[PDB]
């Protein structure tokens, strides 16, 4: 007996550049009758077959969770480009597993805007697959420095989300869950 259907059933995720991650082992899950609650706007696969794992065992099963905007849905894919895929959370080219999301505008779009969830609009370079630069450094867009102040070409790196409910779907808050794996060379833990 193992409790998988937990975090998406939970209420408030982390902002996308602050993506919460769970390592799961010593477990056993239902990958189908939870999928067959297929009210997820988006679901498609890059590692293994869709829901044919229910008798398959793993070393590591991973589940990062965050909230993006609706347009920002497209990004959570091996080989993607943009302030979400480059600066916030990169999926590798060798990605093993899949992703689910659903419209949380119902839940996580506060009337003045969920000014809580945020993303890193700005990084010097681009983060590696599975990287989380939760840095507040006042990004130097311009040559003259910031020293820790906001100002011209000296901007706060993380832009807020401001999920007003009226938004186009592009900006309704989609609650996202990734399923990586590092099943190799350890006990048979997750089936």
């Amino acid at each position, epitope marked *: 007996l193992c409790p998988f259907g937990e975090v998406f059933n939970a209420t408030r995720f982390a902002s996308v550049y602050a993506w919460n991650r769970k390592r799961i082992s010593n477990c056993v899950a239902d990958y189908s009758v939870l999928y067959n609650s297929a009210s997820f706007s988006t679901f498609k696969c890059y590692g293994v077959s869709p829901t044919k794992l229910n008798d398959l065992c793993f070393t590591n099963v991973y589940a990062d969770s965050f909230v993006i905007r609706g347009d920002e849905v497209r990004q959570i894919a091996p080989g993607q480009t943009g302030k979400i895929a480059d600066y916030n959370y990169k999926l590798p080219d060798d990605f093993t597993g899949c992703v689910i999301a659903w419209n949380s505008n119902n839940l996580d779009s506060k009337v*003045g*805007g969920n*000014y809580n969830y*945020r993303y890193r*609009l700005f990084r010097k370079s681009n983060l590696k697959p599975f990287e989380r630069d939760i840095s507040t450094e006042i990004y130097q*867009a*311009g040559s*003259k420095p*910031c*020293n820790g*102040v*906001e*100002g*011209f*070409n*000296c*901007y*706060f790196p*993380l*832009q*807020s*989300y*401001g999920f*007003q409910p*009226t*938004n186009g779907v592009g900006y309704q808050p989609y609650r996202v869950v990734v399923l990586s794996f590092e099943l190799l060379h350890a006990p048979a833990t997750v089936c």
Partner: antibody
Amino acid sequence: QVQMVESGGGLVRPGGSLRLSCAASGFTFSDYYMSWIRQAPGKGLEWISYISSSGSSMNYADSVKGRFTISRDNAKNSLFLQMNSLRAEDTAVYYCAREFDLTKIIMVPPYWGQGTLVTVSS
Amino acid sequence: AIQLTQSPSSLSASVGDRVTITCRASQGISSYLAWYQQKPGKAPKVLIYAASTLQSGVPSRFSGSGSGTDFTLTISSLQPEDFATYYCQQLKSYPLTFGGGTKVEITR
């Protein structure tokens, strides 16, 4: 056609609270670092606070720190002020300005709405 | 925390003279500076931004000058409507600051 509109001045008893409003259009509002300014009648003008493009970051000038409230609505092109525990010296004419455009990196000529009179007396 | 040396504080000019405003600065702000004219009570308006560039529709008589910390605003031939009070603004760090205010006159 760059436009900005202050509205929401008048009388307020000191220790009571007021709320300002800066409706905008003509530019793209959600791009700009917004900010307010006040001028004591005849006296020098004083920046009081700002707000990020995304509302992700703001800060008040010290003369009003905490007591007042920056806020912007990205989808109705409006900046706001909530003014509380007011004072007879908070009395000024309260401008708003459109300053910093992340859509570029170059200098934007800030746009000032026409202002609005707040006078705190009982 | 960048304070501005608005120089001078008051003046009066015969109609159509050249006048010049210094704005020295407590920091090195680079070219992060705008210049504003305030007809009595009205809102201010930009006249020079990027410390040198003219705003749209403005006449040419206003000349933007400066770099680093010393900044100059030139008027070519002063005009009877250019009666105003004037303010330069630092634009580098967000503590957002002005000059004390050059009140400016016409000698008719």
